[PDB]
PDB file of C-alpha atoms in Angstrom:
ATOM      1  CA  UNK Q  19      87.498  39.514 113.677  1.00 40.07           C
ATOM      2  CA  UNK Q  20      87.027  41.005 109.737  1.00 40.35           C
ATOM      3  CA  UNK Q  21      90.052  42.999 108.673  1.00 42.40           C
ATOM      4  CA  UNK Q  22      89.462  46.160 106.828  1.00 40.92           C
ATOM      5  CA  UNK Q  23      93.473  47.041 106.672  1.00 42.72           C
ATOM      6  CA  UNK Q  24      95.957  45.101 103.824  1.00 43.34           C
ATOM      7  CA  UNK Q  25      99.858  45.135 105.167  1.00 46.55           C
ATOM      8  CA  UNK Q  26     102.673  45.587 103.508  1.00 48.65           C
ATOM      9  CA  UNK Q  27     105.855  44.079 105.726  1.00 49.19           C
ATOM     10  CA  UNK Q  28     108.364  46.519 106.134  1.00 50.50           C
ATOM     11  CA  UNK Q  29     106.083  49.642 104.694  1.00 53.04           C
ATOM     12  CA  UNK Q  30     106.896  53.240 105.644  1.00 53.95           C
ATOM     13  CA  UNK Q  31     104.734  55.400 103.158  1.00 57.68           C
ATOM     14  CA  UNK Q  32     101.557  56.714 102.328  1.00 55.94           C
ATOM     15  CA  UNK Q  33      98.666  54.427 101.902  1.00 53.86           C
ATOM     16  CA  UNK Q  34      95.447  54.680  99.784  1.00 50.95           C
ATOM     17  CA  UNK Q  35      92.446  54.043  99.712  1.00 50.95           C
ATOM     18  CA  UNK Q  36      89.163  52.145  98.167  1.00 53.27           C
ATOM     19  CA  UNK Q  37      85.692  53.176  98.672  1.00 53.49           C
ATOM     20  CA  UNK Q  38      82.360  51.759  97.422  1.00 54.86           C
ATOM     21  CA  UNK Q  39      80.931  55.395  96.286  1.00 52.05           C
ATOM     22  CA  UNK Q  40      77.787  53.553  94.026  1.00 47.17           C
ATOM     23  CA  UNK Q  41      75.029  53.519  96.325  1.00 49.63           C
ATOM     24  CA  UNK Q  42      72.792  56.626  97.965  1.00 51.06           C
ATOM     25  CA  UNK Q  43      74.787  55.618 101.707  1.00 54.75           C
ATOM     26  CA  UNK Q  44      78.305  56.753 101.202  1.00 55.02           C
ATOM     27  CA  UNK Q  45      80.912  55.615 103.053  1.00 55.36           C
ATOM     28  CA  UNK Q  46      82.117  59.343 104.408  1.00 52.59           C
ATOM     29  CA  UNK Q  47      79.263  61.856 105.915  1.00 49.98           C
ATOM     30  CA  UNK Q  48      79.028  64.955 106.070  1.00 50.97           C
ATOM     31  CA  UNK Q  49      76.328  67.193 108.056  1.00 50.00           C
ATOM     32  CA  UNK Q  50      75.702  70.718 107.936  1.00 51.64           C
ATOM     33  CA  UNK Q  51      74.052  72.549 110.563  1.00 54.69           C
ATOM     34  CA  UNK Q  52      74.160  76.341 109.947  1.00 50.46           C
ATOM     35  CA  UNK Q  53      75.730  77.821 106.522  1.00 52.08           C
ATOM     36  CA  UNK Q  54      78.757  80.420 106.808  1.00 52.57           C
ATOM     37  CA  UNK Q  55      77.911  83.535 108.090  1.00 55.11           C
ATOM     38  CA  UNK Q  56      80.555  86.410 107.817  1.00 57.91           C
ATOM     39  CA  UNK Q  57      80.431  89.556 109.574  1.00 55.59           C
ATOM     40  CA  UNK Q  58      82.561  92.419 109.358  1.00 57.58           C
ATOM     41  CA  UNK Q  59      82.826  94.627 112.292  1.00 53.26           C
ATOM     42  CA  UNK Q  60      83.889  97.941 110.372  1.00 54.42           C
ATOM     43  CA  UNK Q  61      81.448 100.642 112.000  1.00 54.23           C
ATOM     44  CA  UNK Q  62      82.386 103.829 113.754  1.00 51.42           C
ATOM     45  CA  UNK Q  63      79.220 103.436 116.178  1.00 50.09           C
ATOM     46  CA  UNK Q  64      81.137  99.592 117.543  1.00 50.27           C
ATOM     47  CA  UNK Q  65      82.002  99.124 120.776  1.00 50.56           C
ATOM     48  CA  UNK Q  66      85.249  97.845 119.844  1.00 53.61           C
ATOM     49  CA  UNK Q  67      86.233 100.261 117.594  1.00 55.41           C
ATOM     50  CA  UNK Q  68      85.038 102.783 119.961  1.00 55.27           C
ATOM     51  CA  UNK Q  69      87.216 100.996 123.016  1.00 55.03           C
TER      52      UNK Q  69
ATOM     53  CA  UNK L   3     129.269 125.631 108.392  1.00 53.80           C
ATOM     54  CA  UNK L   4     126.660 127.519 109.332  1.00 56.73           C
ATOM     55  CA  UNK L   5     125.227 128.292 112.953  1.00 59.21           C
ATOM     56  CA  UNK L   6     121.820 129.304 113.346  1.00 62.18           C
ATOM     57  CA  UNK L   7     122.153 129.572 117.186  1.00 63.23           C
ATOM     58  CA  UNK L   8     123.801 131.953 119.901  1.00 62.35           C
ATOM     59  CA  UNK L   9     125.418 130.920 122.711  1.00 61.65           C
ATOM     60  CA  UNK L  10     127.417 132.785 125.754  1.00 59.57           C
ATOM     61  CA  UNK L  11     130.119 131.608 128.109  1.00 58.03           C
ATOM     62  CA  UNK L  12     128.456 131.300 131.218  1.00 58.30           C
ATOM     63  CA  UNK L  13     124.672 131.331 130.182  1.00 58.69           C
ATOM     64  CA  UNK L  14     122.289 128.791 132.619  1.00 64.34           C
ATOM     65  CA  UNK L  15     119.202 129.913 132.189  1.00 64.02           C
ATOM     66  CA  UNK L  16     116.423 130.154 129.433  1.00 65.15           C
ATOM     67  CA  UNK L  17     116.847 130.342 125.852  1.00 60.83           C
ATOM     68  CA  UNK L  18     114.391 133.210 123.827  1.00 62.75           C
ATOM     69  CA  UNK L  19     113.933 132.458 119.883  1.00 62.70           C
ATOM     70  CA  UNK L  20     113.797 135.156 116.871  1.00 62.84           C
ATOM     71  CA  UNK L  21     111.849 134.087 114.056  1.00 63.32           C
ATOM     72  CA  UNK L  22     110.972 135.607 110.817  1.00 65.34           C
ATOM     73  CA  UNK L  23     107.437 134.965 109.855  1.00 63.43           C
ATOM     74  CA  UNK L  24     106.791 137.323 107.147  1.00 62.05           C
ATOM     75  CA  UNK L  25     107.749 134.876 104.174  1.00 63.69           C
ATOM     76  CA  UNK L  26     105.657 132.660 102.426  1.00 65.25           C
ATOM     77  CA  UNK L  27     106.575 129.132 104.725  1.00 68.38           C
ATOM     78  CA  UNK L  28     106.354 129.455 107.993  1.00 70.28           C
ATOM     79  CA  UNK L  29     109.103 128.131 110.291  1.00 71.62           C
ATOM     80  CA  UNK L  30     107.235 125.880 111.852  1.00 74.82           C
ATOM     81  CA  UNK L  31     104.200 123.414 110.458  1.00 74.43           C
ATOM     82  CA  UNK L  32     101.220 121.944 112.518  1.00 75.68           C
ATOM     83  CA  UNK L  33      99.868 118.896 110.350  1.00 75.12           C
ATOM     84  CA  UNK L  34      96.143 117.485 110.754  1.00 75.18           C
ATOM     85  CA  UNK L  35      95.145 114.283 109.602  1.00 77.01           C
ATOM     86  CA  UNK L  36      91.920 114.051 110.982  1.00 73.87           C
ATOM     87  CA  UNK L  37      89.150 116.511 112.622  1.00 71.90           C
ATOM     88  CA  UNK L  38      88.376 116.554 116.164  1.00 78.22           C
ATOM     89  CA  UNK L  39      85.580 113.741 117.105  1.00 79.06           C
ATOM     90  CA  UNK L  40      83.059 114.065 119.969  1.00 78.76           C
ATOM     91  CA  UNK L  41      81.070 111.172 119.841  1.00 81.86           C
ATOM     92  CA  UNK L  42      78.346 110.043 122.451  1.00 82.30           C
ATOM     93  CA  UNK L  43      77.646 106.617 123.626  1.00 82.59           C
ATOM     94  CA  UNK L  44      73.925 106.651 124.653  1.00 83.94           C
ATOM     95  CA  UNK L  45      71.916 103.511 123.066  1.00 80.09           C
ATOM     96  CA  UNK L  46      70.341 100.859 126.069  1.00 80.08           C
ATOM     97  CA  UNK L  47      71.923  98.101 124.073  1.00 80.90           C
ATOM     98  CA  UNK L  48      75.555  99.305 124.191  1.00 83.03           C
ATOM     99  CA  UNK L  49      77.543  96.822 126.010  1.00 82.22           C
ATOM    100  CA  UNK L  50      78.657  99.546 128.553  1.00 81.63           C
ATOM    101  CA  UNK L  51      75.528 100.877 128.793  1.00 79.78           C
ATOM    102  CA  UNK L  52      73.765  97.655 129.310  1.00 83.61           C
ATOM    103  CA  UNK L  53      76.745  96.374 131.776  1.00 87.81           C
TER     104      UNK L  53
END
C-alpha cells in the first residue's frame, strides 16, 4: 500500500495540493462531448407561450 | 364635504346614474393595452396537433 495523502496530527483546515502538470497526460481530464447550445424560446407561434 | 350621491329613507331597490358627458374628459375611461388576437394553431408538427 503507496500513500498519496501527507497528515498533519490534529489538522482541521484546508489542504492543498501538488500536481505533476509537465507532461502531454495530465493528471485531471476533461472531455467534451457536445459544445453549449442556448436557445431562447421567445416566439409568439410557441406552444408554450401559446398555452 | 361634498356628496355626489342621493339617497332616500326607505329606498331598496335600484340605483339610476346622471352623468354629464358633454365636457372634454369623460367620466369614465376604458384603457387598452393591447389589440384583440385571433391566432390559429394549424401546423402537423404542433405538439397538440401532433398529440
Amino acid at each position: 500500500n503507496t500513500s498519496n495523502i501527507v497528515e498533519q496530527d490534529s489538522f482541521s483546515g484546508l489542504p492543498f495540493y501538488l500536481l505533476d502538470c509537465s507532461r502531454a497526460v495530465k493528471p485531471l481530464i476533461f472531455q467534451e462531448r457536445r459544445k453549449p447550445e442556448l436557445v431562447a424560446r421567445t416566439r409568439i407561434d410557441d406552444d408554450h407561450v401559446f398555452m
